[PDB]
């Protein structure tokens, strides 16, 4: 039921600090999401969207964030890259659907929407459904940084450009991940 303020929300969170909505004990329809042509894709892993309408689940979690077009392929079980390693990794036994639609009208500004960020540097990979929001000055070299951001001392959060006039592979794409338990 609280799906309305999850898809039609005004602003979404960055991929490094994605959100999650506790969906439970609510009349849920999954045929409206497939009939609504307001999306760009709808891929389900393990579960079928045809039977999803008549199924009683324990709890449902909806994860929302924003990435790029060429980064959507990384919201899938068993994929690498900047995402699915440092930002949002899915388990290989994932039983759910991954909704993703273009949002160049909202999440991209003409001067440059530097408000959306992604984690570029990290020491260890993210476990499935892990959310790291630290601002540790990443140390890649042999000189320990410890607060200072000099050479080989980078702030791990880089921001997306998000300019409307570029291609679709470089445009912001709003993603909503449906997990069923």
């Amino acid at each position: 039921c609280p799906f309305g303020e999850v898809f039609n929300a005004t602003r979404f969170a960055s991929v490094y600090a994605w959100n999650r909505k506790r969906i439970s004990n609510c009349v849920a329809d999954y045929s409206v999401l497939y009939n609504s042509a307001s999306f760009s894709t709808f891929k389900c892993y393990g579960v079928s969207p045809t039977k999803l309408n008549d199924l009683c689940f324990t709890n449902v979690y909806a994860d929302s964030f924003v990435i790029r077009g060429d980064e959507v392929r990384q919201i899938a079980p068993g994929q690498t890259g900047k995402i699915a390693d440092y930002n949002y990794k899915l388990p290989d036994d994932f039983t759910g659907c991954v909704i993703a639609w273009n949002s160049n009208n909202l999440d991209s500004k003409v001067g440059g929407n530097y408000n959306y960020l992604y984690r570029l540097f990290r020491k260890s990979n993210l476990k499935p459904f892990e959310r790291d929001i630290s601002t540790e000055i990443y140390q890649a070299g042999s000189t320990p940084c410890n607060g200072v951001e000099g050479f080989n001392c980078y702030f791990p959060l880089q921001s997306y450009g998000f300019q409307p006039t570029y291609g679709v592979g470089y445009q912001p794409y709003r993603v909503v991940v449906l997990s069923f338990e």
Partner: antibody
Amino acid sequence: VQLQQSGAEVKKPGSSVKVSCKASGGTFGNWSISWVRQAPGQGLEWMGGIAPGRGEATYAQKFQGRVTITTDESTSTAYMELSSLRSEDTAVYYCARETWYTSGGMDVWGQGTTVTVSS
Amino acid sequence: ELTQPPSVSVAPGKTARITCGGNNIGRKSVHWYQQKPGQAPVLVVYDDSDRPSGIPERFSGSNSGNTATLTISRVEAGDEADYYCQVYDLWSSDYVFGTGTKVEIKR
């Protein structure tokens, strides 16, 4: 806004060729250009793409590791370099503007440059 | 990966229909390019059924899950060209084209 490509080339097999794609309207602006080739009498094939304003280029998995797509904004000309030319790499090579209002397409299409790759 | 029939032959005045079959193609993104002998491809249909400025309303698109079709209404003698369908596969980050369909005008 119109794209102009380089002239046809005849490179011996196993060599490397550089293909230029200049935008007529001064600078490329904040657009992104993709490269598409077409073998003689065959279909269209996507090789890669580049956003000259952000310095980041992505290549198709089939051509990943063989092509090099770079630009320079002193002249605002996109370049595509194909190494290890083979007899099947003969094609008409296009550069096209990636759309921003179509959720995945190609807007303006360059005239096309034709390499032969023959001994 | 977007398979098209090798060629379709429609009689003048009739409607040409060119199917484009793939796996899990976008609910809002199938593009159609007309290419005549020795010319660059021209985008005639985008976003499944939409048309750019200057493309006649004769061209029409349609999509039903895993198969898109191009509709050329009232085909005349100036419609002989190769037509390719193209989408942006979000799950592969690649622009994928079609095998191409040759349109012959009956006579």
